[PDB]
Write a protein that binds this DNA or RNA. Sequence first.
DNA 1: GGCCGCTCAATTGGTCGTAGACAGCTCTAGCACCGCTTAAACGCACGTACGCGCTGTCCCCCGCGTTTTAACCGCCAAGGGGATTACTCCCTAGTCTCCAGGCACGTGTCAGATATATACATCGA
DNA 2: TCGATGTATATATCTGACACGTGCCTGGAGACTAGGGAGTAATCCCCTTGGCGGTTAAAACGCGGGGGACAGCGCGTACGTGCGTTTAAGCGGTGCTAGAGCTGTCTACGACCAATTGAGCGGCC
Lengths: 78, 78, 245, 15, 103, 107, 89, 92, 101, 95
Amino acid sequence: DNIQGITKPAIRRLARRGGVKRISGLIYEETRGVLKVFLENVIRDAVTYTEHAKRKTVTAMDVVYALKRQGRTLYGFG
Amino acid sequence: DNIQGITKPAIRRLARRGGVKRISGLIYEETRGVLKVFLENVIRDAVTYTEHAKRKTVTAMDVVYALKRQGRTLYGFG
Amino acid sequence: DDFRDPQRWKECAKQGKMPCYFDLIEENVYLTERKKNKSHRDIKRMQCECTPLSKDERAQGEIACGEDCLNRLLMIECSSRCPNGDYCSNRRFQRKQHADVEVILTEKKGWGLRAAKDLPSNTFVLEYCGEVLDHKEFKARVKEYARNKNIHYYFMALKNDEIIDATQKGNCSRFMNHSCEPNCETQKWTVNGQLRVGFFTTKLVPSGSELTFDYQFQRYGKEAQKCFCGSANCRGYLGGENRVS
Amino acid sequence: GDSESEIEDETFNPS
Amino acid sequence: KTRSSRAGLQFPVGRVHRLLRKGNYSERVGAGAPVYLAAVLEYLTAEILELAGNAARDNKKTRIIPRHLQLAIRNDEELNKLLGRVTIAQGGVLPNIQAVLLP
Amino acid sequence: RAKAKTRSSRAGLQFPVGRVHRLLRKGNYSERVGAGAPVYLAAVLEYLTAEILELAGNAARDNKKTRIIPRHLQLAIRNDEELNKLLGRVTIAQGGVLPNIQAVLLP
Amino acid sequence: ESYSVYVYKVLKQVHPDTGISSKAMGIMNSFVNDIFERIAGEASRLAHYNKRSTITSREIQTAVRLLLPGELAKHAVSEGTKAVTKYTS
Amino acid sequence: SRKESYSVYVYKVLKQVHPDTGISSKAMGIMNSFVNDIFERIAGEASRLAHYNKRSTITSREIQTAVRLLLPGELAKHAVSEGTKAVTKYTS
Amino acid sequence: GGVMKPHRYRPGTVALREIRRYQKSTELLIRKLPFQRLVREIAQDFKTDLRFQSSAVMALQEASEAYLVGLFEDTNLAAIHAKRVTIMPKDIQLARRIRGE
Amino acid sequence: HRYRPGTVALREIRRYQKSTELLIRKLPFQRLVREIAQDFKTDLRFQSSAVMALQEASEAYLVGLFEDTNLAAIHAKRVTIMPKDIQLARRIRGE
DNA sequence: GGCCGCTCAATTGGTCGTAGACAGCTCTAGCACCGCTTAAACGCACGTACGCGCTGTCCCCCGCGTTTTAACCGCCAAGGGGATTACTCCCTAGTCTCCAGGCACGTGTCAGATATATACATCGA
DNA sequence: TCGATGTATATATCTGACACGTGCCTGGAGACTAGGGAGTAATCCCCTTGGCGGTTAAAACGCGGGGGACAGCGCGTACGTGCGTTTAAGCGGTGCTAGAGCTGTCTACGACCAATTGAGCGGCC
């Protein structure tokens, strides 16, 4: 049960960076759900790439390829 | 100005297919602009494929490829 | 049942015991066909999205294509292709499921209609049956009825090109009187790609009560038909003082 | 009455 | 006998194998790659056609038309996700009305 | 024999030509690679690199800094509309966003 | 060239009493080419990221599990494995 | 093992566009990702163009078309000019 | 002598019927010639004296209609979300902005 | 001395947009990845940069979602974001 | 109507070469764990800004009605342009040979992070 | 009119990231040939642009009126702000050994390709 580890202030700060002035008290669970779904999709792909290479460790390139596949294309990790 | 050729009821009809119960009177000019921009992007790419192929006619494959590049694959004209 | 015997009816009509004879017909009849619009195939296209009732729900008596029927909400009757088939309660016009009504001679307005049983609100009463005419045939029959000096008129505007005439043929609905404070209303229902008009209650109407609706009467005649609804909001004349073409 | 659809959209023929 | 019969498939193996080598996907193509790919393509086609046939029957029609393919693809949770960014010619949309629009 | 200068020098480019040529042949993009494809591609890549670095250096001056940091690249990309449309679905690590408040949120 | 001839054979196996129009057949032709390019392109990426020069059944299986959703991937992978089994014996 | 990169080339270009400006390792990493990403997109599109026209050779002409299809607005015009200019100097 | 007229359809109820009719059907919603001229006119800004196939223009029409349909479907949700029924230009602008254009 | 409700919010927006740091704590996020990954393959292992990358993507994705969500809240003539705003944004984006 | 041939492409056995799987090994890296700091998260009190449901109004877009217009049918014609056989000649892959450009590791240093009061911008009464 | 807290600010301190440097592989450059891709001519024909007459549906247009877009408001909940308290995230540090990355050898797998062969389309009888 680590999703509660994404604290109320962390969600608040992300929303603040996004420009949100006021947040209702039901946003936290929804955001936790969204983050869980996003991570599940990216991790599923990264783990599949990891299994293919016969490796036990998920590298940064594995996450980059998973993010490239889904149309995020993260720069800074090779 | 053939953009006027995309008639008032045609735009209404497309909005009807989209499930819109009531349409304002400023939607038509906005939709015209949006449609023109969309077509300009697709045509520009399709015409580019045609010029590359040393041809003068725009085939259906040229349109399908331009649409595929825009990220909207179209099935039926393959 | 009084209208089911032509001989008794005709003699009672001469004696003033019943209204004059007309051909009793169960549905609207078109005298001349018209160019079949692309909408004619609606017999097929108007598939409702109701859940096919299970053997359990149907055995319990649940209302197939009830108030939440997507076709009912749009005033369209289900065809034989409806998911609920013959169990579908949205085929009232096609199954002739009219209400119980009686024809009465009023003290001062002539013939009228009254409810025979208590009718819940938003309940269907009757279809306005008659002959469908075009503008030329309509004007020809107006010119004849004007020649015959008819006091009562039975023309109902169905669509832009179609007027129903209940003068010579029709049903019991032709006796419902005009009220400025009505208890029933009309609705342009769609049946098998064909347009129909029907009367519906606007509130619960107890038995014995006279049935009335707002005619919105397009007075074309030179003279003016006087209004006898008695309500304080009475327009004085059907269609008021304003004469139209 | 559905054979009318063939006039508007013909059936693919493998031979 | 042909390789399709050996694999127990219906889709061609030669053509899939030919396209992989000719379409520059890698320098080499193995032996099980085209067979596996052909089987997956066939299975997806069968899944589409199965839903298409069912849609045709629920509309009491005996020929698959573009509208039937549209209903089949959009009335499934995962095919919709696979073809969420695809447009089908003469396909239309799923009939639907938002609940605040009905009278 | 004869001397041997690099194809980048012959083309007048700073980005490599030989490396671009190897990646095309060893990346399975086509069976053959023309002798003008790597030169042209290297020039385009170099131009795009110069175009973004120009904006990055300017952003560095605006923040009174000397080195280029991920934030400067983020500012440079999101403040230029043509590069923005080219990189509108790219996330830059440690880059942040643009200072931006909607006009209805403040009195 | 098209895949129409093969689509007929598959169609009769899931539905004997049905036909298919030229437009629907055209859609299926596009669908086969699209899924083929997606899988082959993904297999190409998998081989390239691992510095491999050969696309094998393993490569396709990884690409398929990545490209298709869950339950569908389970059915697809089952069919692929069965096909390669009968092909190799 | 020796590993591929574009750091030295990005640095050389930086020294030309800004003679007195540094760059950090994180930013350089971003630049390497950017060069590889644009390279993969252009080469992929050129491959797609070569395959659609049933050709086997990717030439400067295909790259030019891919570049014109990939870059938005005036940025494409400048890029195309730089490419043509480079090829011209390479031919002479 | 007058013609009585029944009650008009309640506004929007006919619109709902049009929604069902068009959503059920599968056909071109834009006139073919006017659309074909539009394709040609804008194409003249990119290359003079071009020529089009019939299947090519059909494809452009399917994509354009599908694009507007997709746009309106997403925009409708926005109008509903704003506790409104009528669609406004601001709704389309919002839909395009959230989509990423 | 206290600030009027909203003033510190606007101030927070400025400092976080001005800053370039990560907003989620590292350890809680690091465990979250390991838990979610366990359902796909048991007994995995992660590089440090790999978990960082997932965090960069997750925060960038949420920020991107909140900016677009904010437009919906503003569009609805409100200021406070609500779960329906996120739902609308995800439905329009195509998820 | 059905049988013999062609054009294409699918399959086979073999040579051939080299990509990959196994097996060994090294050492980078991730992991578990301890103890303290000190910033952050948490739970609560408070009151204000806001989301909301109701309300009255205006005006806007609908359904309806009628006319105006050019979009489809369709058929026919001219020929621009696309698709497609042979020639050849140019360009590119390939295999060899050579050497300097580029990458890994190694000092030295200097720009940003840390540390503080100064002095100015912004928001509350 | 003017309380009080933050940001940008100037000054110096401090330090580990930058960037310049040498060493020396390995991969790029030059160079040759054989080969076949595609540039081109030369031809064919088929759909495309273009013409018109002609129908009738759709589009344009103009209207009444009633739905809803909208502004303004009263209510009261709920979220922002600030505090005092709690705790675990963060750091620096410990030590272990999983397994990442690599080099090497050999086995078998696939490209090539000549030859072997039928599938599917077609014409000839």
